[PDB]
Design a protein around this ligand. Structure first.
Ligand SMILES: [Zn+2]
Ligand SMILES: [Zn+2]
Ligand SMILES: [Zn+2]
Ligand SMILES: [Zn+2]
Lengths: 69, 69
């Protein structure tokens, strides 16, 4: 049933990191509340891109918080 | 198909507050990383239960962070 596939698809994108789509959300940026996987957060730090992918608010490594589920 | 229902069920419990099961996760406790809905977090504060439901680490209203997805 396709309506159930669609609901599976929406819930999946809520759970997974929106940047890689391969890892679960497990890291929040404390300055804006947006959540990604830790891998993507640190690659963005290693690339000196210190703006949030979603809302472009600025942040640093201290603003990173490990989050569960 | 039941395997798809099951996957829907697991993803749903990842997204929803585990305490009420009615609201989306949208609030993290900064002292331990566990995430609930804001409603449950504040009712627990109004009941002077200042221990995390999941890991029993202690927290207060300042340790609360609004989180998105
Ligand atoms: Zn990622
Ligand atoms: Zn943000
Ligand atoms: Zn709740
Ligand atoms: Zn906890």
């Amino acid at each position: 049933d396709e309506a159930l596939v669609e609901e599976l698809a929406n819930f999946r994108t809520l759970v997974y990191c929106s940047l890689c789509s391969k890892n679960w959300k497990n890291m929040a940026i404390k300055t804006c509340g947006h959540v990604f996987c830790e891998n993507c957060c640190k690659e963005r730090l290693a690339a000196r891109m210190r703006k949030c992918p979603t809302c472009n608010k600025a942040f640093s490594s201290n603003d990173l918080l490990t989050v569960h589920l």
